[PDB]
């Protein structure tokens, strides 16, 4: 069915393919599928940690402080965001 469904992804491989084309001005399907999977994985990792931080609250909702706990609290995520900004 959907190309993102074919890859088993929630992130949109067509949109990411166009984004890659825009930022690399040929982009194969596998580049877009792999990029989507990678962005989805990093997203899942940050949200898992952030949502763990927001457990124990009756209304479970991730705020910027939970994202801070998730990324700043994690040697790899913290170095990734620092390199990325700088």
């Amino acid at each position: 069915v959907s190309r993102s469904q074919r890859a088993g992804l929630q992130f949109p491989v067509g949109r990411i393919h166009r984004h890659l084309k825009s930022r690399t001005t040929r982009v194969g399907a596998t580049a877009a599928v792999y990029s989507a999977a990678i962005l989805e994985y990093l997203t899942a990792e940050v949200l898992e940690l952030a949502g763990n931080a927001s457990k124990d609250l009756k209304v479970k909702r991730i705020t910027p402080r939970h994202l801070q706990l998730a990324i700043r609290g994690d040697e790899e995520l913290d170095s990734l965001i620092k390199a990325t900004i700088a």
Partner: protein, 92 residues
């Protein structure tokens, strides 16, 4: 610049189906995803030029991921990426 917030939300449903996210926190997630993607895409372009590849494929993405992602993030991301590509190139 690009909007991935709705896909971030779907991933959140997967990892924590009872958990919401605030608008500002979602904005931070969208910003981070966009910046990480820009880095991967720039690196992949540089790798394809360096290796004289006419087309950016998952080989260049994977090398960029290894170069850019700290430690175990890279390992797990490479696993996930390879998995997705296998699924995409198989039948369904």
């Amino acid at each position: 610049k690009e909007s991935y917030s709705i896909y971030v939300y779907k991933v959140l449903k997967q990892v924590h189906p009872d958990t919401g996210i605030s608008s500002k926190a979602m904005g931070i997630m969208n910003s981070f995803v966009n910046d990480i993607f820009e880095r991967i895409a720039g690196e992949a372009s540089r790798l394809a030029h360096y290796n004289k590849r006419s087309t950016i494929t998952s080989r260049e993405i994977q090398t960029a991921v290894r170069l850019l992602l700290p430690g175990e993030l890279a390992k797990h991301a490479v696993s996930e990426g390879t998995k997705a590509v296998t699924k995409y190139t198989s039948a369904s």
